[PDB]
Design brief:
About 25% of the residues lie in helices and about 25% in strands. With about 325 residues, the chain is of the alpha+beta class. The structure holds N-oxalylglycine, magnesium ion, nickel (II) ion (NI) and zinc ion. The site of zinc ion (ZN) has 9 residues, from loops. This is Lysine-specific demethylase 4D.
Length: about 325
């Protein structure tokens, strides 16, 4: 069995290997990359996502989210308070202000220490989940706006034609902005490209050990667990590496820098934080190996998780027994 310790793997495809996206994902899995839940892909030196980032300041962040924490430093939840719209230029200036800017630090490890020590005492503002793309239309390789759609994959594998679309999302981050512990909708893959700015640190649990994380989360968040049998779908809970280690939960960590891709694999729980002003683009995707994970994915039916139009068909076709209850949650 390849990669039996479930380490995060890093890949350096050549320009020729960068042509066929599906084939390269399958290659990475042949080497055991999925066992980690997360992989890094460094694009060939010949590749670029677009020519420059000099003209992005007029993008609108219609609903910036202030991430307010409650709990203790290593075990907390966050809720998202909606703020007034602002442009990317206005948000960059805010991120760089004395109130929000990254503190002086020695290296990524020192910054990680400061994040876990101090995150709860601040409420950074995240421009998340903005439909759109920063890939140039002429970029033909690993262009996250030109991937094969999940609806087309389900159709190719299973023969059923379904409604729905699949488009990318932009994330504008600042110091301390945080992504809570989650897997993707319907335990899909994700791919995330860091277009510009400061790094993003990731934590991940191997898919084969995801239920260990879930059992810890039920212990640590006991009211939330009683409210919903899949409350990590709410995407609000944080657990630090120190707490994970104290409870024996297998995980790994890695820092993504500008110009690098990350792939999350089906049922790979992940969480993380931004180091400073940055912009990422991400989208979900599927492969033939996903289908069995989609059929077994948990679902939130309490009403909190509320998701896209396109998840309807996935539930309806892959999980017909759950469909009625899940849809009641959506309405
Ligand atoms: O970058 C972020 O805030 C969150 N991204 C992801 O969870 C992902 O790409 O799957
Ligand atoms: Mg602009
Ligand atoms: Ni994710
Ligand atoms: Zn729920």
């Amino acid at each position: 069995a390849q990669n039996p310790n479930c380490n995060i793997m890093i890949f350096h495809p050549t320009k020729e290997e960068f042509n066929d996206f599906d084939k390269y994902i399958a290659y990475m899995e042949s080497q055991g990359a999925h066992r980690a839940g997360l992989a890094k892909i460094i694009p060939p030196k010949e590749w670029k996502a677009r020519e420059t980032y000099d003209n992005i300041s007029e993008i609108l962040i219609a609903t910036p989210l202030q991430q307010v924490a409650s709990g203790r430093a290593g075990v907390f939840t966050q809720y998202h308070k909606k703020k007034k719209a602002m442009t990317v230029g206005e948000y960059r200036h805010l991120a760089n202000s004395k109130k929000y800017q990254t503190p002086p630090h020695q290296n990524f490890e020192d910054l990680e220490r400061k994040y876990w020590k101090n995150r709860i005492y601040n409420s950074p503002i995240y421009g998340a989940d903005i439909s759109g793309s920063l890939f140039d239309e002429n970029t033909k390789q690993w262009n996250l706006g030109h991937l094969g759609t999940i609806q087309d994959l389900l159709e190719k594998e299973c023969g059923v034609v379904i409604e729905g679309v699949n488009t990318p999302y932009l994330y504008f981050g600042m110091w301390k902005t945080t992504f809570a512990w989650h897997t993707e909708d319907m335990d899909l893959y994700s791919i995330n490209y860091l277009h510009l700015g400061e790094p993003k640190t990731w934590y991940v649990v191997p898919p084969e050990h995801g239920q260990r994380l879930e059992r810890l989360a039920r212990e640590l968040f006991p009211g939330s667990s009683r409210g919903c049998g899949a409350f990590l779908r709410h995407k609000v809970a944080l657990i630090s590496p120190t707490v994970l280690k104290e409870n024996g939960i297998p995980f790994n960590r890695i820092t993504q820098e500008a110009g690098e891709f990350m792939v999350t694999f089906p049922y790979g729980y992940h969480a993380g934080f931004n180091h400073g002003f940055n912009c990422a683009e991400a989208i979900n995707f599927a492969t033939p190996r996903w289908i069995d994970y989609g059929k077994m994915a948990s679902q939130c039916s309490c009403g909190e998780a509320r998701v896209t139009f396109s998840m309807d068909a996935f539930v309806r076709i892959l999980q017909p027994e759950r469909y009625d209850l899940w849809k009641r949650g959506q309405d």
